[PDB]
UniProtKB/Swiss-Prot annotation, chains A, B, C:
Region (Fusion peptide): 79-99
Name this polypeptide is given: Fusion glycoprotein F0
Annotated effect of mutating C300S: Impairs translation or folding of the F protein
GO annotation, biological process: entry receptor-mediated virion attachment to host cell; fusion of virus membrane with host plasma membrane; symbiont entry into host cell; symbiont-mediated induction of syncytium formation
Homology family: Belongs to the paramyxoviruses fusion glycoprotein family.
Shown residues in whole-protein numbering: 27 to 506 of 574
Sugar-bearing residue positions: N1, N44, N442
GO molecular function, one term: identical protein binding
Coiled-coil ranges per UniProt: 50-70, 100-151, 423-448
Length: 448, 448, 448
């Protein structure tokens, strides 16, 4: 299942065995809350029950006023992470919102949700959206509160009506609160925006495959984090916002994680040493004949052995980029490195073990809870599997290794940094490539 | 109104037509909650109403204890973003807090807010601050709860008093909760800290121009995000915190966004290619005879065509920096570039279109929802306006273009990367300048 | 106490006098909520009191279902910050969770918390954990609600029971809500997860020194921010999560902050100027014979003169690294610099003053509130202490200086950038070292 290879020659390790789930699409549903047009009334009733009702009705009216004032606002430019392109993530969402502002378009929805709280409506721009009514405050305030306020004055008050209205009104107040401190766009989508039972019901009614229905349902928390809640409009007794859900159009393709660490010579004199680091670390997933590379592997969520990623955070590379692992000098692909005198010690915890880059006088060991040091690392880049090992210590820093099971393969090889004459080594390329470095080396070697 | 130019020669695009709103100042108001000095009482009453009261009174007492324990704490060092200076953002706030700790100074405020809940008080350090009393728990617990607890024992309990106290006490509990997980400083300022109606009332009573009053009021959500809430003190039946609001001392000056993307030769052999990227991307705003440059354009909030920015996230540059757009080789300003073999494909969505840097074998197209591919990009850097275009596809990644209307201008020109001999091109300067590169080029050209 | 030195020769300043508190360990406690196995009942009672009860009981049942669906999920790869290693921070926590899944292991805990709500239990993996029962919903729903629902139908309803159950059930609902939008791991640990009074009680019962008990208690907010809350399991009427607290195994060692800024020549022609910046800025703490260096000083929390840091965000360096401050050319340590033509003006606010790097035509001054400009900076890198100074202005940006008291020392010296011939200066090393630069200089000087 999940296995791992360490390449001694380049101080890198690849964890493989993973399966992809890459977001490639967006499903945009419209969540609605039916509001009520209430004008406050001349009501002379001291009784504290009525007073509490009116205090809650003010909360309601202020939440609406706040959301309206907010909807004047309607709703960028961001180791190889700078290489990423730039795009807006809520774009299909904002697209749907702009349609909802068209005259007559809100009326279309409330008519669909007149006899049911869940329906599929066709918008004038021709997208079919699932529409939910999740909270009907309209008829509640009208057929529960409104008569008490008006008919025969405030005399007929009931404490269970006070408590019930607090409960009903609360979701509106928390919806508003979230939107107010996020300028109208929310992520992850909270359970206020969409409850667990609602989200699941949404997924079951989507135009997605029976396969995808199962996948999204068994990972709702990941779905929430990759979803957006976009405040859209308040119009004609209706509050509406778009919940924008991830479609995973790439599933169960092979994924592997590349871990890299600095590779340095370990000469007696520590200021005559040269270093080299593979710069292409992160997640890789086979995808439509090419490879999707995610430079900031912190953007992918890993569940078991499935990797949930957003394709907006990837570069698309030739599949030949994998040859950098097995042969960094290959002719098919120019493998990326930096040459920056990073002779500082560190560890990188991998899926099934740990890479240790130990230099200078740093203490670098791997331990077991009950048995003490079982491996001492020497100067250089090395590796230990998580089998029998609990912690890794480099200097004053303690790392815990993952204890998930899997096979590790130590691929012995000569550290490639040894192939270079320190006197002509391009000693500071922040972002270079193997052949690029070889080029400059010869260029200065010609000066003889 | 909003227009855009693409410069083919340098693979960059400038969106202009924007108007500035740059924070240059801070208004520091003092928000107060009047507390009560209650000692719990020997009260033998089982009745569940009283029990619920005492459970809420414990919540109150614990919120106070927590805030006091917190106020022992009272309240850094952070594409050209590293060039930014370092300063504390809550400094004028902390300044006001330190004054509130002076003996007699808290008493000055509570006296001002004795007959009203909104007043302007002059502090001993000579700053005039607007002061609000937003919650008077003191006289509530004293003249609603305290007698019930003591006088004639617990016999006189009332359920509407239970529910009302939960409501009153809640804001205190949420104020506390926020402060407790943020070490006393909050941003964005929540509606617990300052309600929508309060914030607006604050803005109307400030010593700012009638112009600025309108601007801040019509963008309260942006104001919230650029505001700070600083827990200050609990002293003499008073809880006080400072809400620190942005003053926009630069308004309606021209702003433009610079978008850049990698510019590479597209020779048959893909490992003999050289690249070049303008590194000066981000927001630019005319400001006091110079230009305020914001390197991380993700720090500015754009509302319609107004750009809200904080001047602490800007560098101050000569106005001549704009000449980099129209003539990157000009003598007046040394235009910044990097030369790092970024021959990986990507897109940058702009305000009115899209830049596409297409290299290697990557599929790069622009599509329309209903009509399919309408433009196919060739190897190189190119551009397409958002007119008639819905999406842009580079490799496995899909971008949506903005659909706001505006004029786009394609400025044809020779890609400047073509002017360089690949044999002497300084092939890895992470942060260089045009003339810097020309210098090194000649330096190695002299070796002949 | 807190003092500071500015080194004119290298445009850097060191603030010292600080005392360390470095996290080196983790204490993992198990927080438990006792749940109840309730099957809903055939109850024909319209009365609104009962209706509200059943609505709250549904909230309870849905919170449990949600947490269970979440626990299918169970629970990386991240100026010198890239040099940091990579490790999982919740590892000892996840370790404890995996043990709690073992059969019989949950039963061990609930038996310990059968007669008390706080006990120390020994897990089968041999770790002694403090275990809390913080909410006993089991016997509440059973001996308060369950009979009302069943026995003699719904006739016996009581409003104080409605309100009380809302209160009891609320913590569960907020625990769930937090976990649901964070995939099961929370930080900072909220007061829902662990109340202020609970956290403190935990600290008092830990196997830590009387010294450490005092330290953690007087800084609970820092403890919260450096803690993790890990959703673990729902099994046998028990909900359990791990709260993972920082152990500070390094305390009261000397800490100092290094501030650096760009150092450039200021020749008449501004495009013939060379620059140099020390790249080793951030926090430094003596630690076990070496120095713990934190490259992103934004990761350390400073309280008074104590510095709270996590050792996972540090590199371990020789103590000789301090010699870079007093003599950047020393033979013992190769001091790190960049040489990147950063001739853009800026300020860095320090602990007791301000560094100003002023270049070009930028206006750079230091002011006092009431007295105006008291210092004007010239082209170059300079410094001013916070004594008598309120603000610093560089270009269009205004900085506030800290007003804490302490001694500042201006160490005069020749700017080292003056020692270099601009014609052979390696004008763009993003991450180099003094001797590295000297090397390349001679290498190109040999070509004569």
């Amino acid at each position: 299942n999940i296995t791992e290879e360490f390449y001694q020659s380049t101080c890198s390790a690849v964890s493989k065995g993973y399966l992809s789930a890459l977001r490639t699409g967006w499903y945009t549903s419209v969540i609605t809350i039916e509001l009520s047009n209430i004008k406050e009334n001349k009501c002379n009733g001291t009784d504290a029950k009525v007073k509490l009702i009116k205090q809650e009705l003010d909360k309601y009216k202020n939440a609406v006023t706040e959301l309206q004032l907010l909807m004047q606002s309607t709703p960028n430019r961001a180791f190889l992470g700078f290489l990423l392109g730039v795009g807006s993530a809520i774009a299909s969402g904002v697209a749907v919102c702009k349609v909802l502002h068209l005259e007559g378009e809100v009326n279309k929805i409330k008519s669909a949700l007149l006899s049911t709280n869940k329906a599929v409506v066709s918008l004038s721009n021709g997208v079919s959206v699932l529409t939910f009514k999740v909270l009907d405050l309209k008829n509640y305030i009208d057929k529960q509160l409104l008569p008490i306020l008006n008919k025969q004055s405030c005399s007929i008050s009931n404490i269970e009506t006070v408590i019930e209205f607090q409960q009903k009104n609360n979701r509106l107040l928390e919806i508003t609160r979230e939107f107010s401190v996020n300028a109208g766009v929310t992520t992850p989508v909270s359970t206020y925006m969409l409850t667990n039972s609602e989200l699941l019901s949404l997924i079951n009614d989507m135009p997605i495959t029976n396969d995808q229905k199962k996948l999204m349902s068994n990972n709702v928390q990941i779905v929430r984090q990759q979803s957006y809640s976009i405040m859209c409009i308040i119009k004609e007794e209706v509050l509406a916002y778009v919940v924008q859900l991830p479609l995973y159009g790439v599933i169960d393709t092979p994924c592997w994680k590349l871990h890299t660490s600095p590779l340095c010579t370990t000469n007696t004199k520590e200021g005559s040493n040269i270093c080299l680091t593979r710069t292409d670390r992160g997640w890789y997933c086979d995808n439509a004949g090419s490879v999707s590379f995610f430079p900031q592997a912190e953007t992918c969520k890993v569940q078991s052995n499935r990797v949930f990623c957003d394709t907006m955070n990837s570069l698309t590379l030739p599949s030949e980029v994998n040859l950098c692992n097995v042969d960094i000098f290959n002719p098919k692909y120019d493998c990326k490195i930096m040459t920056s005198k990073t002779d500082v010690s560190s560890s990188v915890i991998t899926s099934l073990g740990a890479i240790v880059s130990c230099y200078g006088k740093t203490k670098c060991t791997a331990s077991n809870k009950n048995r003490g040091i079982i491996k001492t690392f020497s100067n250089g880049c090395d590796y230990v599997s998580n089998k029998g090992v609990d912690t890794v210590s480099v200097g004053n820093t303690l790392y815990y290794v993952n204890k998930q099971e899997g096979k590790s393969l130590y691929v012995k090889g000569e550290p490639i940094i040894n192939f270079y004459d320190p006197l002509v080594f391009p000693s500071d390329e922040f972002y270079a490539s193997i052949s690029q470095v070889n080029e400059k080396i010869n260029q200065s070697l010609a000066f003889i």
